[PDB]
Amino acid sequence: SRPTVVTVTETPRNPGSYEVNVERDGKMVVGRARAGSDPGAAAAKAMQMAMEWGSPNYVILGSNKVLAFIPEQLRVK
Amino acid sequence: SRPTVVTVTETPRNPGSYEVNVERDGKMVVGRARAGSDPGAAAAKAMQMAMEWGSPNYVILGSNKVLAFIPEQLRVK
Amino acid sequence: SRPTVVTVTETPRNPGSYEVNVERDGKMVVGRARAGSDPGAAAAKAMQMAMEWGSPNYVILGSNKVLAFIPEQLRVKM
Amino acid sequence: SRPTVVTVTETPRNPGSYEVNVERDGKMVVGRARAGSDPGAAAAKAMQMAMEWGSPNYVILGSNKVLAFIPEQLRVKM
Amino acid sequence: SRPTVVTVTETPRNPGSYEVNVERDGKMVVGRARAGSDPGAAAAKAMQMAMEWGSPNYVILGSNKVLAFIPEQLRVK
Amino acid sequence: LSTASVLAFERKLDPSDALMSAGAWAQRDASQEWPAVTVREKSVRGTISNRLKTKDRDPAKLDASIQSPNLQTVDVANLPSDADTLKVRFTLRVLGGAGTPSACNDAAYRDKLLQTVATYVNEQGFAELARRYAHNLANARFLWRNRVGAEAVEVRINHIRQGEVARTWRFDALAIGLRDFKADAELDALAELIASGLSGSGHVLLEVVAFARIGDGQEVFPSQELILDKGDKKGQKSKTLYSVRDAAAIHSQKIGNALRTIDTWYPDEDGLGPIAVEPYGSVTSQGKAYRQPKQKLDFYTLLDNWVLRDEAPAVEQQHYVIANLIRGGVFGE
Amino acid sequence: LSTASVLAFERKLDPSDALMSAGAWAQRDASQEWPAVTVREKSVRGTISNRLKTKDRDPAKLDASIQSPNLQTVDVANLPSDADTLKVRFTLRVLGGAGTPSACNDAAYRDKLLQTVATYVNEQGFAELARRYAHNLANARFLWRNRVGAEAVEVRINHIRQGEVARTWRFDALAIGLRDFKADAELDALAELIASGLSGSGHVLLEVVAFARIGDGQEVFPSQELILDKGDKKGQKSKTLYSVRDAAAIHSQKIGNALRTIDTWYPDEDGLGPIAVEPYGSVTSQGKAYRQPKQKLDFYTLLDNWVLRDEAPAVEQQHYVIANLIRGGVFGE
């Protein structure tokens, strides 16, 4: 509702690679942009999209291998 | 978000080349600056952008080829 | 955050020239000092800053054209 | 860091003058000794500081104008 | 280090006087021997120390004021 | 009829980064192998000489930061102790085709604007603007602080056609001042050669060299650099000079800004001198802004009234509008 | 009306680095080809004579014991064994236009400041300041530690036009003391020549040569270098001297400090001598600071009062403020 939503999923068509979706104002601002082949690159792409498309506020969701690289403080704003 | 966040991403329009973003207290002070064309120079640029602008604490994110040049005790502070 | 960190980075405003930064114990001892106009002068300045500053341990970061002059991981870390 | 490391760096306070630093084994034995006023004297001072102060291994680092006078990848490493 | 090395360095404790070092096959044969008080005598002593102490593959190093008294073909064997 | 929402003009008078070298006077005719000027770096020891902040800090305890020095690092440039002439060399192109936009959005507005520019270029050829650009080239205005203490500035301008030079001009940059615009036969020749390429009749590529005589071992002033990813912690350098591969140089936009200072028509001038031709013509280095949109002498109001409303202004404001179209930029909506 | 947030002034009296040569007395009149002095290294073996600030029986001793020697490396510059005179040469350039600032965020504050400086120059010229600068040039204050045990000092000043020298002054620097500011005949002509360039009515470039007789074989003292990259390892060099192209030299800011010390009007007893003109009037090597901001005696208080509130101070404080903006600096709030 209020913040942007960044979702980092793992593409099931090949295991080990990831994709990011950015949703703002109830509509999809960015869809299926690729985010690397390891969880670190997925965390970097997620935080970059959160910074740029973040506006005032944002929430980062996604896989548990990806969110192990981001501290729990830096997942909401 | 209290600490500084330095994210190194790879440009998907030209593979092999990297870019760096710095967060710095909820408003980005560096946007899509040119890091190196290899993981070593991306690691050097990330550590430079963490040395400045990271006065209390910082967090460095990035790929596994990039973060293989920094020891595990120097990425988070 | 115990060893001294030495970083060598290329200036994007003119390609080919490098600058070195040195941090020891959370305090930036050297900020954006001129290293040179080739990777060899950058490697020499980085090894000099690792010899003088950072007596117990050090880590040297830099590009892959610059770290090709230092022996591979034997003298880069301590 | 086993081999003796010899570095030759150019002073930016006046261009065209060099300095040499030697480190044998965890300790600095020569710090900022005047190399010369041209690349030839800096290369000669580097080879002199590598002849002595040397175990069966050493390493010489310098810019791409000083490392031209040293024979190509033959006398630079040991 | 197979070619014999002959270096001519100016002593910084008094400017204008030179000293020559000669190394052959891993161990040094001449250490800090006196040359003249001018680049001509220093270049002549470098040539003389190049004739002896290595018949094949001598290298002669020195300043540009010293390596200007010998021809360009007589500096590297 | 309404103005477009996308309008993108391209710039004429394309300059280049000018490189600095050092040598001696009375050898300028063989000054093609003069060595460069290198950007040195030095550490200094000085005093605290800024305004102290005594709002809520220590009022009498830590205010003994005076009686203790501060040690800084700076870039600096200098001539050698045997050289007393600075040499600055750049190139320049004149392109032509200044009325057409490079990327438009509307159809009838573009066809009206082309006729509005065409009736001006028919009734008045590019004579005044080329004259003032030749004046700004003739006096060495592109040496900014290197022109202050000089005793002899000398400018050479070549018209390079197919590699080798076809026509040279030589000027003494201290006789041609910076205030008034007076005549000369060489200045008329250069003005017509500029106007040829400004109309579009030919191909104009010039090479401009300038020699300044300042003295032995004095200080020269290259461009200081703006760094936007520097970080604000401590221990930085705070003065970084601009150099192009071990040779101190000047930015190209600064030389274009020096060449653009032809605007002698604005509201409150009483002979103070020209400013650069900008929309809402303003000097941020002085804080003043001439040509505010409150008074109707703004660029956008003049252009809208000229094209849409068929209100032909005075001839000097026509010179100002056409000079802004030659300058280039992004206009629309 | 307030003071601007960005305000900056350029530097007048721009010197160069001084170069040092060695020779014999009574050949001063033909000293165009004397060889330079060179910095040479040397290693000394001395004793440990310093305060043992650790414990008497320290477990981790941060120093060494007294029964052992310590070996060090230092730089040193000497005269040759046949030469007994030292020659020091530099150049000076007087620019003019000391009122206008380079950058100014405000518009009203700039022209108010220009009116204030203009009524100062129209009231009295640049005569007192140029007399003080000519005194600091006449007695060789700039030689520093090389002036102390000297037997005789001589100063030659040349006024250089387009070609050759057009005017020559010769002073005996030991009759003109470092304390008093007396009057002469040639010194008034030199002061008028400096004042004409300070006002703006000419181009003034001087060449200054100084000869000092300190005995043959003795030690000379060039400027010592401050290095901010060297750090924290046992085995370093303790003393590095400044040199340009294998020749000992003195920094340019040290000669600027030696020519700038004209301030004899500070709050305390100024009978002991003059100090340098700077904001907050501080001599750091002595560890003191005159002109503290407790009273209204520092630079910024006088300047803000004079410009914003029209309160003209005494004439000596006006001389101090005008010399402080001849010096230059960043004065912004």
Coordinates of C-alpha atoms in Angstrom, one line a residue, chain B residues 9 15 41 44 50-51 53 61:
Chain B
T9 CA 25.9 -5.0 -9.1
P15 CA 28.5 -8.6 -18.9
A41 CA 38.5 -3.4 -9.1
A44 CA 38.6 -2.0 -4.4
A50 CA 33.0 2.0 2.5
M51 CA 36.0 3.8 4.0
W53 CA 30.7 7.6 4.0
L61 CA 27.0 -6.4 -0.5

